[model samples]
Target: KETGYYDVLGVKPDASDNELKKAYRKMALKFHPDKNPDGAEQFKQISQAYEVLSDEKKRQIYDQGG
Candidate 1:
């Protein structure tokens, strides 16, 4: 999907499932747009990262394939 998605959520490539979830929420709030006006794009950035990396199938293929 998106490039640098791992960095988008501030997680390492091999970050665990729950790890990704925690980071996603953390970054989501960090870049909530309401909190950081310039973070609108970043909000979607981490959100998309979590969406893919959170999935078992997508996450598996993402590590080696993406």
Candidate 2:
């Protein structure tokens, strides 16, 4: 029952919108390809996680196992 999006952002499923924003920012900075070439893939994952979690409708679909 694990949510890969939540795991990627390192936050709980119930995390607030602001929390997701903050976490994404931190992870983006930490894994930016320019700063950490080895983390390029991880950065992409985080970006995708944020993209889905940032949209309410998308988040709902994801939560419902769509």
Candidate 3:
């Protein structure tokens, strides 16, 4: 269902607004390393990548090629 965004988020870029947000959260909950309790920083990083990715113009370029 989220393929349109996922497609562009795949390469030439790794930015699926939904995919990034959803994926990051999904992974965040379980992706945190068991080694360190301080791993909460992971989500912070995820949000940074996905949040900063609002620059859809760049994403637009790869979606149809600038």
Candidate 4:
């Protein structure tokens, strides 16, 4: 049931929206495909994790193991 989204973003499960956004931006910049070609897959994973966590409904659904 645990997708490890928060772990992927290096944030606590209770992290605030602002914290989530900051973490997402940091990770995106760190692993951007242009900057780190070998990290493209990881960037994609991070992006997906952020996409779900950044959305209220999606976060709720994800937390509920949907």
TM-score of each: 0.80, 0.85, 0.40, 0.83
Q: What are the per-residue Cα lDDT tens digits for candidate 1 across 6-66?
A: 8888889989988898998898788766779987776777777889889988888877785
Ranking by lDDT: 2, 4, 1, 3
As a whole number from 0 to 100, the lDDT of residue 11 in candidate 2 is 91
- After best superposition, candidate 3 residue 29: deviation in angstroms? 1.3
**How good is model 4 by TM-score?**
0.83
Question: Runs in model 1 with CA error above 4 Å?
Answer: 1-3
Q: Identify the runs in model 2 with alpha carbons over 4 angstroms from their true place.
A: 1-3, 33-35
Error of 4 at 7 (Å): 0.5
lDDT of 1 at 46: 73
Clashes of 2: 0
* Models, CA RMSD each: 2.1, 2.7, 7.7, 2.6
Candidate 3: segments with Cα more than 4 A from true spot:
1-15, 31-36, 54-66
Could you tell which candidate, 1 or 4, scores higher by TM-score?
4
Q: Tens digit of lDDT per residue, candidate 4, span 1-66?
A: 354999999999998899999999999898767788799778778889999999999999988983
Q: Over the full model, what C-alpha lDDT does candidate 2 score relative to the true structure?
A: 0.89
Report lDDT (Cα) of residue 46, candidate 2.
Answer: 91
Q: In what order do the candidates fall by TM-score, top score first? A: 2, 4, 1, 3
